[PDB]
Amino acid sequence: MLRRQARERREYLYRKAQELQDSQLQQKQVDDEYAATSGIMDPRIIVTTSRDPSTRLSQFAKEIKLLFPNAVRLNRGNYVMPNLVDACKKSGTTDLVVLHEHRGVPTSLTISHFPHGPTAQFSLHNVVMRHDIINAGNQSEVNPHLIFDNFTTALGKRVVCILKHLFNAGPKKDSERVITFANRGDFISVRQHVYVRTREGVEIAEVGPRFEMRLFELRLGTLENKDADVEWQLRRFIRTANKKDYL
Amino acid sequence: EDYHKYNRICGDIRRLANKLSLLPPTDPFRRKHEQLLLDKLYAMGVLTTKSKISDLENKVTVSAICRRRLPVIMHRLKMAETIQDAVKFIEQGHVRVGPNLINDPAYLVTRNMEDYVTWVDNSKIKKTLLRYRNQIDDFDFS
């Protein structure tokens, strides 16, 4: 197996080079890691947290689980990262979500797609959980509708492609739950709403949570592999960082 | 070194593709045997990646068939210094491809069976390897 994972890794990086040159020539479809399974097998998701999570992070991890229909929350007590990724691959998991916090406030969210990546890391800002709502009620767990807005650049399409496959295929036309990822100066706003089609329009009710995610790393490999080749990184100390847009 | 046989296989692949290319593109029969052909060539590994019939016309080579020979695989896989040394180990019966022992140097590994080429359990030379690391287990007989 160690021989296979290496060989397939060597094969995996080969396509990403091959597709990159093909894309450049086209410049002059779905990504390969998802092309094999897109629209066939419903995504398998695991949501976990860092070691010794605080209560608020645990509540947030539950919220992220409710966001994605096929997400199951797993407690990370003492788990070793190679073991965690290895175990998830054995179970057939498709993507792994790990949440980090600072003083009971979520700060980061990293999404790694099995078996060979990619791994995307996000930073959470202005996080508002539904447990911060009184008499909020329970969620509806139908397959939601998805809204992606203002994703134009090639990196933008890549980011949409990562998030898009985390949900099920073929939501019912009349499904009332809509999830929207709105890009605004690289700050992707995430909202959850339930709508009712009226006789003269549509009225939406926000369910929550609210939080802004901004990609700052994207690596060709599982989150365990720290040596994985970086597809894209966020340059913060360049003089144009304060006004450079990437999505 | 003689490659008349391997040349016969490569030529036959080209002839089959040429005969296919003669058949109507819309014929369902043509399409499947093409895909079946590409599948088996992929299955053996001579096609490293899934390709098209046009690539199958030229990408197939004697070297690709020679590449899949069991002694050659070990050479890349670093079991033996040289192809001759690999042949001797295959000859002496120290090499095991999955559940079965292969004493024929002429055998080639399919793509799936590559990951399981490994030396027989009680080979004396394994005892040298684990002895060098000092990881020999007599309980495991190796």
Binding site: - | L77, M79, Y132
Partner: peptide, 28 residues
């Protein structure tokens, strides 16, 4: 080097694997 250490075949085989202070220095 990490990739080399990460990818080392455990089954790789090579043939090499079969194989007063001044008074002390004079003695040796």
């Amino acid at each position: 080097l990490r990739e080399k250490a990460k990818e080392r075949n455990p089954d790789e085989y090579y043939h090499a694997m079969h194989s007063s202070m001044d008074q002390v220095k004079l003695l040796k």
